[PDB]
Design a protein around this ligand. Structure first.
Ligand code: TPP
Ligand code: MG
Lengths: 527, 520
């Protein structure tokens, strides 16, 4: 740290020291903190730059870490980490072993809530504030939420509840944060005292306003002013819409991530961004299907968690033919635990009347989208990872036989049953071990006849998937075998029973034993 | 039927004769329909008589799409859409569904049961209708409780953005309109919801308006065991807090709400906020208990995963209506919580087999500080088990109930009396497993080494369920002992009494014995 470059930032290693600075020094501190961020974080974080003055004001006014400051998701919280003891580590953000992208409870007493999904801050802040009142030590609570995050249903539920029971909570609406990857009437109607919009870049103005609002009772609201699978999906949307008036596609505020930018411009009448609203995304699709359109819900595995009840109740129970294009399935890399696509094979396959498909390459991905798009008896899901595929030829489209796998190699003694994009690693292993290899294609319905044939011809089976082992695709294979009283041992390879930490997709797969070398070692150790 | 008592209603078994009535007969029609409901079948259905008459009189149903949010507000709808001769079978095995059900009538646009789905679906129907370009109209009816749900706000906010031709009727049982105006609706009301002629005139106008329109009209059960336990714990522990998403009576919380009002939080129909609010209380070093039905917990799954499990916060989930729920049918079954909770890291999942176990497990999860715990139990009465003094149960350990030979039955939950009869008949070993997660791995492997076959029993989907986790342990240890997994089949379970639906699915002693004998 170059104390001569940042002589004011040099004085405030702790927020206790920050609170001792003369107020007159705070604009210079904000300049230095903005320069230090630019000089220090690797190439993205415009909302971090835009929240510098707010962050200084908040830690200057609130007695953190005793008073509780809860950040909603976003790079708005980078300056926060710099001021709470992690200045010299800020260049490690998102690296394996480095700082978390967002506040993480285990990382600092100053991180009240681990975030990553959006819109959780107000709800948690109401709990913290109710607890603070009962504790009766005059602890205060503030949360900072971006304008994207405030579109989610659970933020409305939280604000409505705050209007009812009237916690002593300050909510700061930060228009600098987008929350992904006049103005006060609504919040007043929900029961808040509303101030603003104020200048979010006036550190002294914010200190004065926050000092007053921190002392008020009840709910307070301050308003401050080579191809990726995603590209494969977006290309397929465009090809399909060009020939079929029925296709409609929906994203809950993840147009760029899900690969839909070109589609949104070529087919604007087929494209719906419903904001950060996964639950509405799904039930809106159910309504389009009742209307005899063919909706595709583009949604990340991790965010689909939040729309589970709409998948079960508003789609599967109705047998409506909605197609789910599930991106960021499996290991997602840099965003770490809060974002992994770790559970969708488990939580979707226990639901009746769901078809669940796991392509092993980008051709299979297209074939499965096509198959699910023309499958009319009920909903279909196709899940695929962040990142590139194998370079597979994109073959002419044809519906795949439902619930049938594909034999890739005939070997002996061991059969490997692959679900999804780890197939090239399993192919290397099966050559090395002279094993049988099968690309299962379908997690549900499973190819039971192929499972029984494999079990009748090998001493042991291996299942492979980029999902939790517990309840996952391989667990489904186990169930078929046991139902047929064929107790042939199966090694279920997949994600272990802990939340998967950050790193490159490649290095985290290797750490989990999900490359060819890891898979081979697991088989040998188990045999 | 009884033409004498209802001489206007008698002539309008379908909406086509309904629309042939002169306006002047609709008031008498409404009186007759209300009396018919009183005689043939709750309060919310009585309350929607006039609205229902007005809607079907003005809208060209079933071509125009009318969507009902959940509630017995839809009983009159079924009487006017050709099903009045069946209204006496509602909620019975083989009878009419309690709520509109797509397969039951072309007048049922959306199957409902969970709340707050009507606006979202209505926006899709309305967007489809505009693209169809055949002048089809769309209208939905939502209750004042259902509009508290986060997905209803998401839908209203999207309606304000894309401006579909949809009428939302708030069936409400400054000013109230400002919120809906700010979300982007044209707001009318509040109006008299029992002036049928006034509603016909208003609906006629608003059906013809473009864009988003908003019309505002004016032995103890396990639940009791849980509520009693909350009271006893809060009496001696200031940290206890209990949360319900608007299901106070069903979750057994009435007395608790009256004795501990300062520790009781009804968050409205807001499962998502219920869970993350609990996470905040736990961060604040209180001990929250979230009371929630299995089927509704589906809607808070992301908050369980991201705001509780990833945080390692020690929230207690008291999961009622687990397993087969009986009369409410498919939309309400507690069919999946053992599957969707056990794949989540750092979750403890407990399945008590009687009232005493239920209390022991609530106490155990309440005093477990390393992460969240869930205790799931069915609707209905327990066995009469003696309530023993409370102490924490050793984590991930099951109990041997009977020693036999050849077969071992591994029970998760309240079908244990049935497993016990079977175990006697077959001279099978019987184990009460207690924990779905973590499993008693040591015991599973000992049972497999001592028997030719295992049987698992749970009142949850077989797919992904507790017995599926036993399979996984055996496979991980490269064992070769087959396991019969007994549980809920892979279809949504229809309505009936709990006893008769369990019998149908083979989850009584007789059906379990038969499944074992057939499989061997
Ligand atoms: C997600 C969800 N949570 C809880 C329920 C339980 N529930 C059924 S009806 C109701 C209240 C709404 O009905 P009401 O206000 O009594 O009058 P109505 O709309 O029938 O006229 C609730 C909370 C539900 N159906 N869905
Ligand atoms: Mg109501």
């Amino acid at each position: 740290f170059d104390i001569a470059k940042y002589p004011t930032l040099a004085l405030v290693d702790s927020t206790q020291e920050l609170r001792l600075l003369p107020k007159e020094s705070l604009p210079k501190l904000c300049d230095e903190l903005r320069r230090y961020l630019l000089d220090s974080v690797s190439r993205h974080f415009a909302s971090g730059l835009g929240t510098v003055e707010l962050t200084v004001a908040l830690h200057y006014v609130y007695n953190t870490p005793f008073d509780r400051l809860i950040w909603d998701v976003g790079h708005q919280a980078y300056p926060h980490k710099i001021l709470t003891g992690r200045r010299d580590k800020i260049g490690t953000i998102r690296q394996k072993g480095g700082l978390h992208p967002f506040p993480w409870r285990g990382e600092s007493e100053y991180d009240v809530l681990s975030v990553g999904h959006s819109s959780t801050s107000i709800s948690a802040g109401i709990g913290v504030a109710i607890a603070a009142a009962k504790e009766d030590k005059q602890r205060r609570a503030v949360c900072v939420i971006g304008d994207g995050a405030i579109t989610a249903g659970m933020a409305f539920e939280a604000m409505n509840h705050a209007g009812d029971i009237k916690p002593d909570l300050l909510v700061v609406l930060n228009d600098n944060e987008m929350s992904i990857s006049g103005p006060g009437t609504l919040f007043e109607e929900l029961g808040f005292n509303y101030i603003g919009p104020v200048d979010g870049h006036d550190v002294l103005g914010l200190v004065s306003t926050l000092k007053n609002m921190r002392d008020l009772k009840g709910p307070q609201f301050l308003h401050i002013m080579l191809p990726s699978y995603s590209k494969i999906f977006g290309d397929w949307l465009c090809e399909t819409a060009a020939k079929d008036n029925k296709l409609m596609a929906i994203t809950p505020a993840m147009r760029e991530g899900s690969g839909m930018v070109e589609f949104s411009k070529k087919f604007p009448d087929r494209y719906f961004d419903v904001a950060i609203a996964e639950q509405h995304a799904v039930t809106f699709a159910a309504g389009l299907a009742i209307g005899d359109y063919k909706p595709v819900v583009a949604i990340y595995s991790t965010f689909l968690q939040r729309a589970y009840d709409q998948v079960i109740h508003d789609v599967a129970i109705q047998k409506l033919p909605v197609l789910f294009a599930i991106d960021r399935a499996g290991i997602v890399g840099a965003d770490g635990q809060t974002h992994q696509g770790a559970f969708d094979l488990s939580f979707l396959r226990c639901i009746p009347d769901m078809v669940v498909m796991t392509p092993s390459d980008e051709n299979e991905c297209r074939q499965m989208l096509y198959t699910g798009y023309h499958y009319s008896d009920g909903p279909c899901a196709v899940r695929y990872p962040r990142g590139s595929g194998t370079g597979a030829t994109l073959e002419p489209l044809a519906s795949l036989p439902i619930g049938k796998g594909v034999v890739k190699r005939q070997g002996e003694k061991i059969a490997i049953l692959n679900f999804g994009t780890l197939l090239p690693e399993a192919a290397a292993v099966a050559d090395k071990l002279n094993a049988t290899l099968v690309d299962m294609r379908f997690v549900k319905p499973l190819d039971t006849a192929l499972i029984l044939q494999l079990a009748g011809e090998h001493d042991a089976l291996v299942t492979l998937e980029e999902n939790a082992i517990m309840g996952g695709a391989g667990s489904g294979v186990n169930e078929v075998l046991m139902a047929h009283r064929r107790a042939v041992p199966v090694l279920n390879i997949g994600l272990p029973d802990y939340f998967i930490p950050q790193g490159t997709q490649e290095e985290i797969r290797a750490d989990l034993g999900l490359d060819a070398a890891g898979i081979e070692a697991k088989i040998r150790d188990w045999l």
